[PDB]
mmCIF file of C-alpha atoms in Angstrom:
data_model
loop_
_atom_site.group_PDB
_atom_site.id
_atom_site.type_symbol
_atom_site.label_atom_id
_atom_site.label_comp_id
_atom_site.label_asym_id
_atom_site.label_seq_id
_atom_site.Cartn_x
_atom_site.Cartn_y
_atom_site.Cartn_z
ATOM 1 C CA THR U 1 85.521 109.784 79.775
ATOM 2 C CA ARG U 2 88.273 107.204 80.359
ATOM 3 C CA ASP U 3 90.618 109.504 81.865
ATOM 4 C CA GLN U 4 90.824 107.744 86.019
ATOM 5 C CA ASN U 5 93.722 109.601 87.339
ATOM 6 C CA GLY U 6 93.913 111.516 90.356
ATOM 7 C CA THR U 7 93.676 110.435 93.809
ATOM 8 C CA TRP U 8 90.106 109.625 95.158
ATOM 9 C CA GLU U 9 87.700 109.163 97.930
ATOM 10 C CA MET U 10 85.644 107.571 98.848
ATOM 11 C CA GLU U 11 81.919 108.934 99.349
ATOM 12 C CA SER U 12 79.802 105.533 99.503
ATOM 13 C CA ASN U 13 79.821 102.095 100.004
ATOM 14 C CA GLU U 14 76.461 99.803 99.972
ATOM 15 C CA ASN U 15 77.257 96.729 100.068
ATOM 16 C CA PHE U 16 80.076 95.947 101.130
ATOM 17 C CA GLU U 17 79.212 93.754 103.791
ATOM 18 C CA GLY U 18 77.580 91.624 100.618
ATOM 19 C CA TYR U 19 80.439 91.461 98.312
ATOM 20 C CA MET U 20 82.872 90.168 100.901
ATOM 21 C CA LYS U 21 80.478 87.306 102.451
ATOM 22 C CA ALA U 22 80.720 85.859 98.992
ATOM 23 C CA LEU U 23 84.493 86.909 98.835
ATOM 24 C CA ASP U 24 85.090 84.707 101.929
ATOM 25 C CA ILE U 25 86.776 86.841 103.861
ATOM 26 C CA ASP U 26 86.768 85.724 107.494
ATOM 27 C CA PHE U 27 83.720 87.154 109.759
ATOM 28 C CA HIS U 28 86.434 89.411 111.918
ATOM 29 C CA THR U 29 87.724 90.567 109.138
ATOM 30 C CA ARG U 30 84.460 92.241 107.795
ATOM 31 C CA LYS U 31 83.315 93.867 110.187
ATOM 32 C CA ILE U 32 86.927 96.093 111.253
ATOM 33 C CA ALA U 33 86.116 96.910 107.264
ATOM 34 C CA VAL U 34 82.787 97.827 106.914
ATOM 35 C CA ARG U 35 83.903 101.200 108.553
ATOM 36 C CA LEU U 36 87.263 102.556 107.086
ATOM 37 C CA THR U 37 87.155 104.926 104.422
ATOM 38 C CA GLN U 38 88.952 103.905 101.039
ATOM 39 C CA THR U 39 90.896 106.430 98.975
ATOM 40 C CA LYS U 40 91.976 105.344 95.390
ATOM 41 C CA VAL U 41 95.201 106.517 94.160
ATOM 42 C CA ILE U 42 95.127 105.768 90.177
ATOM 43 C CA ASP U 43 97.973 105.989 88.340
ATOM 44 C CA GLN U 44 97.709 105.557 83.730
ATOM 45 C CA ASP U 45 99.175 106.085 81.116
ATOM 46 C CA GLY U 46 97.124 104.896 78.296
ATOM 47 C CA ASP U 47 96.659 101.560 78.319
ATOM 48 C CA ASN U 48 98.280 100.955 81.352
ATOM 49 C CA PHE U 49 97.061 101.909 85.242
ATOM 50 C CA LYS U 50 98.460 101.556 88.497
ATOM 51 C CA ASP U 51 95.801 101.299 90.770
ATOM 52 C CA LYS U 52 97.126 101.308 94.119
ATOM 53 C CA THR U 53 93.472 101.634 96.738
ATOM 54 C CA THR U 54 94.213 102.283 100.979
ATOM 55 C CA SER U 55 91.789 101.708 103.297
ATOM 56 C CA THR U 56 92.112 104.416 106.211
ATOM 57 C CA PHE U 57 90.181 104.348 109.895
ATOM 58 C CA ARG U 58 91.516 107.712 111.019
ATOM 59 C CA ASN U 59 93.690 110.204 110.193
ATOM 60 C CA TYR U 60 95.657 112.915 112.839
ATOM 61 C CA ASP U 61 97.485 115.794 112.434
ATOM 62 C CA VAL U 62 99.856 117.571 114.380
ATOM 63 C CA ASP U 63 102.051 120.534 113.866
ATOM 64 C CA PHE U 64 104.631 122.730 115.992
ATOM 65 C CA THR U 65 107.633 123.888 115.970
ATOM 66 C CA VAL U 66 110.457 123.402 118.172
ATOM 67 C CA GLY U 67 110.302 125.537 121.028
ATOM 68 C CA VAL U 68 107.220 127.092 120.976
ATOM 69 C CA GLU U 69 104.707 126.013 123.937
ATOM 70 C CA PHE U 70 101.610 125.135 121.308
ATOM 71 C CA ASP U 71 97.703 123.726 122.265
ATOM 72 C CA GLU U 72 96.918 120.417 120.914
ATOM 73 C CA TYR U 73 93.367 119.737 120.965
ATOM 74 C CA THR U 74 93.291 116.033 120.100
ATOM 75 C CA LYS U 75 90.194 115.781 118.270
ATOM 76 C CA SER U 76 89.290 111.528 118.009
ATOM 77 C CA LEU U 77 91.332 110.738 119.720
ATOM 78 C CA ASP U 78 90.554 111.732 123.312
ATOM 79 C CA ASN U 79 89.631 115.077 122.648
ATOM 80 C CA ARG U 80 91.209 117.169 125.332
ATOM 81 C CA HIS U 81 92.922 120.097 125.797
ATOM 82 C CA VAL U 82 97.166 119.440 126.698
ATOM 83 C CA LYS U 83 99.690 122.694 126.467
ATOM 84 C CA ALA U 84 102.472 120.931 124.420
ATOM 85 C CA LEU U 85 105.998 121.423 124.187
ATOM 86 C CA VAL U 86 109.051 120.137 121.805
ATOM 87 C CA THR U 87 112.196 120.543 122.572
ATOM 88 C CA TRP U 88 115.730 118.675 121.286
ATOM 89 C CA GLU U 89 117.165 116.921 124.317
ATOM 90 C CA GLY U 90 120.355 115.416 121.970
ATOM 91 C CA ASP U 91 118.717 113.824 118.679
ATOM 92 C CA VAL U 92 115.992 112.558 120.677
ATOM 93 C CA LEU U 93 112.428 114.369 120.111
ATOM 94 C CA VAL U 94 110.499 114.907 123.060
ATOM 95 C CA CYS U 95 107.216 116.404 123.902
ATOM 96 C CA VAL U 96 105.892 117.097 127.113
ATOM 97 C CA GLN U 97 101.576 117.130 127.376
ATOM 98 C CA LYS U 98 100.767 118.663 130.164
ATOM 99 C CA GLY U 99 97.449 119.039 130.449
ATOM 100 C CA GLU U 100 94.736 116.492 132.573
ATOM 101 C CA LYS U 101 96.620 113.359 132.129
ATOM 102 C CA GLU U 102 99.843 113.071 133.785
ATOM 103 C CA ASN U 103 102.796 111.708 132.466
ATOM 104 C CA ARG U 104 101.451 112.008 128.982
ATOM 105 C CA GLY U 105 104.155 112.676 126.265
ATOM 106 C CA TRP U 106 106.247 111.035 123.911
ATOM 107 C CA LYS U 107 110.001 110.591 122.207
ATOM 108 C CA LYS U 108 110.565 110.341 118.329
ATOM 109 C CA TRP U 109 114.583 109.550 117.567
ATOM 110 C CA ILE U 110 116.175 108.441 113.924
ATOM 111 C CA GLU U 111 119.163 105.672 113.915
ATOM 112 C CA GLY U 112 120.110 104.243 110.317
ATOM 113 C CA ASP U 113 116.014 104.362 108.682
ATOM 114 C CA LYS U 114 114.446 102.840 112.159
ATOM 115 C CA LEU U 115 111.783 105.891 113.976
ATOM 116 C CA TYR U 116 112.142 104.879 116.774
ATOM 117 C CA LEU U 117 108.743 106.220 119.166
ATOM 118 C CA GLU U 118 107.605 105.641 122.446
ATOM 119 C CA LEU U 119 104.212 107.168 124.041
ATOM 120 C CA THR U 120 103.719 107.755 127.553
ATOM 121 C CA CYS U 121 100.723 108.616 129.654
ATOM 122 C CA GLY U 122 100.591 107.928 132.775
ATOM 123 C CA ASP U 123 102.094 104.490 133.662
ATOM 124 C CA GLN U 124 101.786 103.064 130.193
ATOM 125 C CA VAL U 125 103.925 102.967 127.797
ATOM 126 C CA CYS U 126 104.292 102.197 123.760
ATOM 127 C CA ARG U 127 107.193 101.544 122.001
ATOM 128 C CA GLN U 128 106.655 101.761 118.331
ATOM 129 C CA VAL U 129 108.870 100.765 115.326
ATOM 130 C CA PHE U 130 109.156 102.401 112.213
ATOM 131 C CA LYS U 131 110.940 101.649 108.816
ATOM 132 C CA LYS U 132 111.606 103.877 106.549
ATOM 133 C CA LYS U 133 109.456 104.403 103.093
ATOM 134 C CA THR E 1 120.152 112.680 113.490
ATOM 135 C CA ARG E 2 117.962 115.614 114.000
ATOM 136 C CA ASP E 3 116.440 114.634 110.033
ATOM 137 C CA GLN E 4 113.128 112.669 111.027
ATOM 138 C CA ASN E 5 111.433 113.920 107.380
ATOM 139 C CA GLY E 6 109.665 110.954 105.641
ATOM 140 C CA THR E 7 107.535 108.449 104.995
ATOM 141 C CA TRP E 8 106.909 106.058 107.610
ATOM 142 C CA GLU E 9 106.437 102.492 107.993
ATOM 143 C CA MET E 10 104.981 100.588 111.399
ATOM 144 C CA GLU E 11 106.966 97.916 111.710
ATOM 145 C CA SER E 12 106.118 97.245 115.870
ATOM 146 C CA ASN E 13 103.840 98.581 117.988
ATOM 147 C CA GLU E 14 103.894 96.600 121.610
ATOM 148 C CA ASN E 15 101.176 97.815 124.397
ATOM 149 C CA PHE E 16 98.877 100.858 121.819
ATOM 150 C CA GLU E 17 96.333 99.125 123.803
ATOM 151 C CA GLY E 18 97.761 99.908 127.190
ATOM 152 C CA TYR E 19 98.835 103.351 125.627
ATOM 153 C CA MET E 20 94.714 104.360 125.168
ATOM 154 C CA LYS E 21 93.259 102.780 127.722
ATOM 155 C CA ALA E 22 95.521 105.015 130.091
ATOM 156 C CA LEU E 23 93.806 107.904 127.622
ATOM 157 C CA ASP E 24 90.568 107.044 128.299
ATOM 158 C CA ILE E 25 90.175 106.285 124.944
ATOM 159 C CA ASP E 26 86.343 104.505 123.813
ATOM 160 C CA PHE E 27 86.346 100.803 124.149
ATOM 161 C CA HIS E 28 84.759 100.461 119.928
ATOM 162 C CA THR E 29 87.735 102.495 118.623
ATOM 163 C CA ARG E 30 90.140 100.826 120.762
ATOM 164 C CA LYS E 31 90.013 96.970 119.413
ATOM 165 C CA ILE E 32 89.989 98.327 115.846
ATOM 166 C CA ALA E 33 92.527 101.003 116.102
ATOM 167 C CA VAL E 34 94.869 98.320 116.997
ATOM 168 C CA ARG E 35 94.823 95.651 115.188
ATOM 169 C CA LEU E 36 95.458 98.491 112.531
ATOM 170 C CA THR E 37 99.312 99.109 111.100
ATOM 171 C CA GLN E 38 99.904 102.673 111.423
ATOM 172 C CA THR E 39 102.016 105.580 108.476
ATOM 173 C CA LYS E 40 103.667 108.590 109.604
ATOM 174 C CA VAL E 41 105.119 111.207 107.090
ATOM 175 C CA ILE E 42 106.226 113.871 108.510
ATOM 176 C CA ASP E 43 107.301 117.536 106.685
ATOM 177 C CA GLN E 44 110.061 118.691 108.929
ATOM 178 C CA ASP E 45 112.474 121.712 108.054
ATOM 179 C CA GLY E 46 114.356 122.992 110.833
ATOM 180 C CA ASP E 47 112.878 122.788 113.758
ATOM 181 C CA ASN E 48 109.512 123.197 111.724
ATOM 182 C CA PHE E 49 107.508 120.062 112.369
ATOM 183 C CA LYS E 50 104.224 118.533 110.125
ATOM 184 C CA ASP E 51 103.213 115.691 111.265
ATOM 185 C CA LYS E 52 100.802 113.530 109.862
ATOM 186 C CA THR E 53 100.013 109.723 111.533
ATOM 187 C CA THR E 54 96.643 107.159 110.085
ATOM 188 C CA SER E 55 95.710 103.986 110.680
ATOM 189 C CA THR E 56 95.797 101.800 107.714
ATOM 190 C CA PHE E 57 94.874 98.182 107.606
ATOM 191 C CA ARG E 58 95.436 95.894 104.854
ATOM 192 C CA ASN E 59 96.393 97.985 101.390
ATOM 193 C CA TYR E 60 96.024 95.902 97.327
ATOM 194 C CA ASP E 61 97.845 96.919 94.370
ATOM 195 C CA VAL E 62 97.255 96.221 91.104
ATOM 196 C CA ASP E 63 98.817 96.874 87.954
ATOM 197 C CA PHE E 64 97.655 95.989 84.461
ATOM 198 C CA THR E 65 97.752 96.863 80.661
ATOM 199 C CA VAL E 66 94.433 96.624 79.363
ATOM 200 C CA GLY E 67 93.846 94.339 76.824
ATOM 201 C CA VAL E 68 96.409 91.935 78.404
ATOM 202 C CA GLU E 69 95.550 89.204 80.716
ATOM 203 C CA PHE E 70 97.514 88.425 84.224
ATOM 204 C CA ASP E 71 98.009 86.852 87.344
ATOM 205 C CA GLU E 72 96.143 88.406 89.973
ATOM 206 C CA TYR E 73 97.251 86.668 93.697
ATOM 207 C CA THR E 74 94.423 88.657 95.166
ATOM 208 C CA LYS E 75 96.746 89.288 98.464
ATOM 209 C CA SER E 76 95.260 91.285 101.497
ATOM 210 C CA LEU E 77 91.462 89.899 99.815
ATOM 211 C CA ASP E 78 91.245 86.226 100.182
ATOM 212 C CA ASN E 79 94.432 84.927 97.905
ATOM 213 C CA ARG E 80 93.303 83.757 95.639
ATOM 214 C CA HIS E 81 94.631 82.976 92.293
ATOM 215 C CA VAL E 82 92.475 84.843 89.386
ATOM 216 C CA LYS E 83 93.630 85.536 85.512
ATOM 217 C CA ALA E 84 92.352 88.710 85.670
ATOM 218 C CA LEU E 85 91.423 90.393 81.691
ATOM 219 C CA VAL E 86 90.267 94.333 81.415
ATOM 220 C CA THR E 87 89.296 95.711 78.831
ATOM 221 C CA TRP E 88 87.690 98.671 77.643
ATOM 222 C CA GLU E 89 83.461 98.815 77.107
ATOM 223 C CA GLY E 90 82.743 102.424 76.159
ATOM 224 C CA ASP E 91 84.281 104.389 78.788
ATOM 225 C CA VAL E 92 83.736 101.901 81.008
ATOM 226 C CA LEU E 93 86.610 99.890 82.376
ATOM 227 C CA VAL E 94 85.439 96.559 82.527
ATOM 228 C CA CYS E 95 87.657 93.475 84.367
ATOM 229 C CA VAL E 96 86.359 90.149 84.171
ATOM 230 C CA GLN E 97 88.596 87.513 87.029
ATOM 231 C CA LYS E 98 88.417 83.994 86.213
ATOM 232 C CA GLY E 99 88.673 81.812 88.574
ATOM 233 C CA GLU E 100 86.708 79.853 91.726
ATOM 234 C CA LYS E 101 83.960 82.297 92.413
ATOM 235 C CA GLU E 102 81.286 83.223 89.200
ATOM 236 C CA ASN E 103 81.200 86.646 88.542
ATOM 237 C CA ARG E 104 83.540 88.166 89.794
ATOM 238 C CA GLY E 105 84.655 91.013 88.880
ATOM 239 C CA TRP E 106 84.188 95.005 88.983
ATOM 240 C CA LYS E 107 83.082 98.195 86.767
ATOM 241 C CA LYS E 108 85.734 100.890 87.015
ATOM 242 C CA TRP E 109 83.609 104.480 84.967
ATOM 243 C CA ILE E 110 84.121 108.565 85.711
ATOM 244 C CA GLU E 111 81.331 110.254 85.473
ATOM 245 C CA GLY E 112 82.423 114.025 85.941
ATOM 246 C CA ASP E 113 83.969 114.830 88.989
ATOM 247 C CA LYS E 114 83.621 111.261 90.457
ATOM 248 C CA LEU E 115 85.331 107.838 90.262
ATOM 249 C CA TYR E 116 82.673 104.876 90.360
ATOM 250 C CA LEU E 117 83.062 101.568 91.367
ATOM 251 C CA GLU E 118 80.533 98.402 90.906
ATOM 252 C CA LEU E 119 83.031 95.218 92.572
ATOM 253 C CA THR E 120 80.727 91.238 91.628
ATOM 254 C CA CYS E 121 81.316 88.122 93.658
ATOM 255 C CA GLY E 122 78.254 85.363 91.980
ATOM 256 C CA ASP E 123 75.631 86.670 93.656
ATOM 257 C CA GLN E 124 76.568 90.022 95.065
ATOM 258 C CA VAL E 125 77.462 93.793 93.547
ATOM 259 C CA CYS E 126 78.793 96.511 96.133
ATOM 260 C CA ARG E 127 79.322 99.677 94.430
ATOM 261 C CA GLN E 128 81.087 102.510 95.809
ATOM 262 C CA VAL E 129 81.550 106.197 94.205
ATOM 263 C CA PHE E 130 84.392 108.142 95.085
ATOM 264 C CA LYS E 131 85.609 112.265 94.003
ATOM 265 C CA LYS E 132 88.325 113.843 93.002
ATOM 266 C CA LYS E 133 90.276 114.863 95.832
#
C-alpha cells in the first residue's frame, strides 16, 4: 500500500552508525544519536508529504490532583519513592517531594507564554524556561 | 495565571547537571541528558494535571511533492544542500539527494503494520523498521 499516514515508532535500527559516518556527522553527535529511539509522524495527502522525525531519549509522565498527596515512583529517573503534594502558592505551582532526599521538589508558574520551572534537590537548583509551541 | 495547558519547548536550562548530580543520576544518563533539549506537554483541567516531559535532541522535518524536485538543506543533519527528488516505484517511495555525497537518498515503503526505511549514503546503508502506533 502507498498509505504511509500515521505515527510510527522505531523498533530496529541497523547500521545507523555507518550511515552517519558516511554523512560526515561529527563523532560526538554520532554517539548521542546512535542510542535514541525514533518517532515518525507522516502527514500525506495524495502526492504531498509532511514528514516529521523526532528522536527521543526518555519520556517521564506524572499525573496528580492539586491538594492530593500521591506516591511518585521516578522510574527511568533516580527510581525512588517520594510522597509528593502539589499546591497553589498564588499562581505558582509548588510541589514538595517528601522522601529519601532533602529539599526535593519543583515550582511551576506561567507568565505570558513562558513557563518558568525550577527543580530543587538538596542544595542544587535547576532553572528552566519554556516558550510555548 | 493558573493555566499551564499546552505544549512547551525548552528555551534555557541552567544547572541541569547539578540537579541530576544531586539525584545521584547515573553518569551514563547524565552526560546524554544535559546535551538534549526538552519538551513538556501539560494537559490541565482545573486542579487535575497530566504532565509529560521528553528528552529530545534534534528534530528533522521535510516537505515534498512526489515528482517535484526541491531544495533540501539538511539542517540538523550535516547541513549540506542537496536537490532531492521523491518518486514512486510500485509502492516504494524512493528519494535521490543529488549533491556532494554519492548514492545518497532513502527508500520508504509499507508492509502491513510496519514502516520500512532504508537510508543510503555512498558505501553505507542504514535500515530501520517502525510500527504504527
